[PDB]
Amino acid sequence: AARNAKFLDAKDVTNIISAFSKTGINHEKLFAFLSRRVQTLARVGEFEAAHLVILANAFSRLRYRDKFLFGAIARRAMSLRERVTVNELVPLIVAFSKIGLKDPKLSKRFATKAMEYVDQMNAEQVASMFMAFAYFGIRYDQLFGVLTNRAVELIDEFNAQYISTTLNAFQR
Amino acid sequence: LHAFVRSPHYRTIPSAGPNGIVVNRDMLVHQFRDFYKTLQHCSLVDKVHLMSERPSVEALRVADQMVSIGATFLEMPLTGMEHRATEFMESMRYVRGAGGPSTLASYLQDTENCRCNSGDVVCLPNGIAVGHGPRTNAVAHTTLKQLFEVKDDQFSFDVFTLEQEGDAPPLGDYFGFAGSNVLLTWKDEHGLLAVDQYQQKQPHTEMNVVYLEPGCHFLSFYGVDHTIDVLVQKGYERSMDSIAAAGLNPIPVQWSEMDKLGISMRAAVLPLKFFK
Amino acid sequence: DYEEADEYGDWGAEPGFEDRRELDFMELSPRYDPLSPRAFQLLHSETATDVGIASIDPSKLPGQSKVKNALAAIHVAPNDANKMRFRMAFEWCLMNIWNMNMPGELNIGAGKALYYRSVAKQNRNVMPLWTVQKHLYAQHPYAWFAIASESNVAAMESLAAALNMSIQQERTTSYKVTIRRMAEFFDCELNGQLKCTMMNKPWDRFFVSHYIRSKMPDLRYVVRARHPIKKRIA
RNA sequence: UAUAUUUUUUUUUUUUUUUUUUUAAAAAAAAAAAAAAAAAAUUUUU
Numbered sequence: 001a002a003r004n005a006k007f008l009d010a011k012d013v014t015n016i017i018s019a020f021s022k023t024g025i026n027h028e029k030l031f032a033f034l035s036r037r038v039q040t041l042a043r044v045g046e047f048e049a050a051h052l053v054i055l056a057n058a059f060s061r062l063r064y065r066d067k068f069l070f071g072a073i074a075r076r077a078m079s080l081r082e083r084v085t086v087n088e089l090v091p092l093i094v095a096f097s098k099i100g101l102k103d104p105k106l107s108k109r110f111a112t113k114a115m116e117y118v119d120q121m122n123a124e125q126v127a128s129m130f131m132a133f134a135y136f137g138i139r140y141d142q143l144f145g146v147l148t149n150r151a152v153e154l155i156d157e158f159n160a161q162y163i164s165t166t167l168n169a170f171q172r
Numbered sequence: 173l174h175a176f177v178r179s180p181h182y183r184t185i186p187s188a189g190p191n192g193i194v195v196n197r198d199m200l201v202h203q204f205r206d207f208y209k210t211l212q213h214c215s216l217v218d219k220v221h222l223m224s225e226r227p228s229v230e231a232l233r234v235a236d237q238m239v240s241i242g243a244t245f246l247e248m249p250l251t252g253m254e255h256r257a258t259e260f261m262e263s264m265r266y267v268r269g270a271g272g273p274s275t276l277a278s279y280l281q282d283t284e285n286c287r288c289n290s291g292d293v294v295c296l297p298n299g300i301a302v303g304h305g306p307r308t309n310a311v312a313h314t315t316l317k318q319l320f321e322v323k324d325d326q327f328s329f330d331v332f333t334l335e336q337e338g339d340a341p342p343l344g345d346y347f348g349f350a351g352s353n354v355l356l357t358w359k360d361e362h363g364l365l366a367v368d369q370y371q372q373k374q375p376h377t378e379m380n381v382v383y384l385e386p387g388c389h390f391l392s393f394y395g396v397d398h399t400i401d402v403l404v405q406k407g408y409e410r411s412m413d414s415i416a417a418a419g420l421n422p423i424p425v426q427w428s429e430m431d432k433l434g435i436s437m438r439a440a441v442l443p444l445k446f447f448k
Numbered sequence: 449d450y451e452e453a454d455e456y457g458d459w460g461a462e463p464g465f466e467d468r469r470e471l472d473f474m475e476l477s478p479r480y481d482p483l484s485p486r487a488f489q490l491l492h493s494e495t496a497t498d499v500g501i502a503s504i505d506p507s508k509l510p511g512q513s514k515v516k517n518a519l520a521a522i523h524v525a526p527n528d529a530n531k532m533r534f535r536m537a538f539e540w541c542l543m544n545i546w547n548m549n550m551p552g553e554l555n556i557g558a559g560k561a562l563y564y565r566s567v568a569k570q571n572r573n574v575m576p577l578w579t580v581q582k583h584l585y586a587q588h589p590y591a592w593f594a595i596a597s598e599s600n601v602a603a604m605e606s607l608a609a610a611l612n613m614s615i616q617q618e619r620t621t622s623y624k625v626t627i628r629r630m631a632e633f634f635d636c637e638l639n640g641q642l643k644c645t646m647m648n649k650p651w652d653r654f655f656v657s658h659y660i661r662s663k664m665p666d667l668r669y670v671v672r673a674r675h676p677i678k679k680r681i682a
Numbered sequence: 683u684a685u686a687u688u689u690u691u692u693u694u695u696u697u698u699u700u701u702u703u704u705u706a707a708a709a710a711a712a713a714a715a716a717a718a719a720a721a722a723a724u725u726u727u728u
């Protein structure tokens with residue numbers, strides 16, 4: 001794969017990255033080549049709103065950080081306005097927060113998008129994105145307030161398994 | 173149905189191309205992405221693949237290497253193109269990435285002495301057209317006569333050797349062809365000569381002809397599929413009306429700066445047919 | 449996020465074992481690159497993960513009255529195991545460098561190999577040598593520092609008298625420079641008269657071994673070679 | 683001697699210094715800094 005990370009399309013690249021994420025290898029040259037190729041492909045829109053989640057999750061779990069790649073992925077997700085649903089938005093936030101050693105002005109824009117996706121989401125993504133925003137380290141008074149306002153309706157759906165995360169994020 | 177293009181190099185792109193007019197480096201990059209979007213929407217090509225970056229700007233000509241006439245391919249002869257042969261190697265990879273090697277034009281590349289250029293050979297319904305001029309020899313026409321020729325009531329295929337002057341551009345540049353018996357031609361001396369030469373051959377073709385003002389770059393492909401669309405430069409307005417009056421939908425694209433560079437529609441993309 | 453049981457190899461018999469090249473004592477992963485160790489081998493003096501075997505006479509034992517030799521597992525001194533691993537790596541390095549036929553050099557440096565805090569995966573303290581070896585060979589969260597003292601100079605002069613050292617060069621002042629470039633890197637040693645008399649590439653780290661002692665003085669064994677270059681450009 | 687990028691073209695606001703004019707105060711210009719903003723720049727022979 002290392003010598004063939006250049007001659008691939010989008011689907012092959014995302015499939016190969018997803019396959020290599022789970023194994024646990026840390027070949028640096030392969031990851032650099034695939035990051036370049038992803039950056040080159042993301043210049044002109046060539047990723048549907050289903051492979052960005054896979055790429056971000058695989059890179060975040062792989063424990064590899066790059067400002068340029070994540071910026072390009074965020075920009076491409078930003079271009080496809082109204083196409084990404086909440087069910088396809090929360091995992092991106094989780095993946096970006098798992099590598100939370102980042103800079104502001106990125107979670108700032110993600111706060112704006114989260115405003116209109118609070119209505120049609122259940123308690124699981126509520127707690128998960130709440131922990132993610134807590135790990136971002138930026139005080140979002142209005143976002144936290146609206147999350148608190150909307151969270152009380154689905155208090156019945158709380159299975160008490162993920163109550164620990166939403167309780168611990170406040171302490172965080 | 174497979175189309176290949178190459179992104180330009182921003183650092184080594186030269187201003188003031190070989191016509192005495194300066195160019196804007198940023199404007200090329202700005203226009204290339206819109207060209208990509210138009211190409212991938214214009215429904216003339218099934219797939220578009222983005223080739224990697226290379227330093228030489230003369231490498232932006234993805235074509236002039238390898239021509240698709242049918243299920244098989246034909247590589248171009250190595251004559252004066254050795255200085256960039258290396259990058260040619262890379263191109264093939266992308267082709268083989270999603271396609272087979274076909275015949276590798278062993279019969280064409282190794283044909284003793286060869287002088288061929290992508291654009292001298294243009295396909296047509298039950299026909300092939302070779303622009304015999306300062307770029308193509310008669311040996312190539314004889315080889316195509318040997319290879320791509322069949323003659324019967326239903327196995328009907330023909331080859332037309334078209335004469336042109338020394339100063340004429342390559343055949344596929346000016347006079348092209350679009351599906352459903354529509355033939356596009358420049359309204360200059362070269363186009364009139366080509367139309368007359370075609371008319372003297374096979375009078376039973378019944379091919380309607382539409383004229384365009386000279387100096388217009390357009391892309392149109394026969395293809396296994398049938399489609400009514402053409403790609404035209406967003407310059408001369410009268411050509412759009414002239415071609416739309418015949419029932420063909422035109423699509424405008426901007427190529428001012430790349431025209432000053434000297435890059436045509438034929439060499440901007442690489443059409444290919446991939447089968448199983 | 450926001451094997452360990454099998455690390456000791458106890459919960460079964462890993463199928464397809466022992467059918468691999470003898471690279472147990474070193475970490476080898478599959479061209480010129482500076483600051484890129486091609487073979488890492490961590491070592492220690494107090495702790496050594498190697499057991500030994502020895503012969504015995506079991507004739508007394510009730511039932512083994514017909515066998516004269518029987519092997520038993522005995523622990524071994526760490527220094528002998530360290531020496532065995534060192535020579536096992538050294539023969540491999542010698543064969544490799546002979547096959548490549550590069551100009552061979554060997555360095556034994558004195559200094560401290562100070563590591564970084566991020567080495568400890570899982571934020572644990574006690575871990576087997578294997579895992580720390582893999583972590584060092586993969587992430588490289590370490591840095592080498594060379595330092596000595598002036599007060600021992602006369603002392604090691606006694607070592608000279610102990611080892612009949614002979615002076616081949618006195619105190620010399622040299623201006624080391626790193627003549628970098630946009631494509632490759634190079635180095636030079638300006639003399640007192642200030643001219644460039646050598647032109648060469650940076651050293652290629654082919655094998656690194658850290659011998660850590662209990663106290664301050666630690667040892668670093670390095671095998672490095674220099675790739676050839678046409679003298680025209682030089 | 684196992685932490686690679688640094689950033690950049692251009693618009694808005696604020697602060698500091700200098701020259702000029704007028705009545706300690708106001709305005710234009712030059713230089714510097716800070717904040718913000720639109721937009722752009724990476725480097726493999728199986």
Ligand SMILES: *O[C@H]1[C@@H](O)[C@H](n2cnc3c(N)ncnc32)O[C@@H]1COP(=O)(O)OP(=O)(O)OP(=O)(O)O
Pocket residue numbers: 624626651683
């Ligand atoms: O060990 C290195 C290092 O301490 C220092 N050095 C060289 N190049 C360096 C860069 N780019 N960054 C930081 N430090 C650097 O100098 C030595 C190089 O070797 P040196 O001490 O001069 O002598 P030695 O290894 O015995 O033999 P050389 O041929 O390498 O000089």
